[PDB]
Amino acid sequence: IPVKKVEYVFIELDKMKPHEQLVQRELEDFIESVTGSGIFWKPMLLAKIPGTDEYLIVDGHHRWAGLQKLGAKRAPSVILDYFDEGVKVYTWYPAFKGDVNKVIERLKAEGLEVIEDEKAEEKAEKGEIAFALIGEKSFAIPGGLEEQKKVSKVLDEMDQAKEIELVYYGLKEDAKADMEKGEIDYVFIRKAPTKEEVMELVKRGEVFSPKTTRHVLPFIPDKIDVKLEDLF
Ligand code: NA
């Protein structure tokens, strides 16, 4: 898709509402980058929540949260019509380099079930279980939203402890191709939400587990060049 210079507008951070949780490494990396470079270059993508003067964060949770942590006030933003057909939503695929037996033990310690099930991926994609865990073997992790959050918490902890390397793939096919090559061991598969589900969630004040949405527009917003000091 084409890159397009789009006009941004500064929006106050306190008007932005998240729809998903954070990955600690991504939060800390953003803070390190923006303070080290002094430049904010990737605009927030926002959509107004109907009946309010608040915005759904479409893209930029880690940027918003990092700026809030730094004590900033505003961020450059592109305002979208969320239900325009050009706005599409997919998901991310958490994958790891590491020992699946250690991951499974940690998942079970958090009260999750991990069940060998050759239909796990199909069930996950239908929204019937929290995640499928797919590699040499195929496991179902039953549940829904709360169980997805428990899985993600374990992964973030193991990422921080360097027990695994935790990476997020945009495309399931890419994760599977890298597993074939021996670059990753297992991938977690869940169903993407619909846009209607995202907006319903933010309207009730709730959030998904980290990296639940991956939004795509008909164009790529060109990068911008805003000084960090201008956000305060
Ligand atoms: Na997202």
Numbering used by the authors: 11 to 242
Authors' description from the paper:
A 26 kD nuclease from Pyrococcus furiosus used in the current study had resisted crystallization inspite of extensive purification and crystallization space screening. Here, we report the successful crystallization of a nuclease employing a reductive methylation protocol. The key to crystallization was the successful introduction of 44 new cohesive (NZ) CH...O contacts (3.2 – 3.7 Å) by the addition of 2 methyl groups to the side chain amine nitrogen (NZ) of 9 lysine residues of the nuclease.
Electron density for only 9 amine nitrogens out of 32 (including the N-terminal amine group), could be unambiguously assigned as dimethylated. Forty new intra molecular (NZ)CH...O contacts in the range 3.2 to 4.0 Å were generated because of the methylation, of which 25 interactions were between 3.2 to 3.8 Å. The methyl carbons of all the dimethylated lysine residues were involved in the formation of multiple new symmetry-generated intermolecular contacts. The structure reveals 96 new symmetry-generated inter molecular contacts in the range 3.2 – 5.0 Å involving the (NZ)CH group and 28 of these inter molecular contacts are of the (NZ)CH...O type and in the range 3.2 – 4.0 Å. The methylated protein lost its ability to cleave DNA (results not shown).
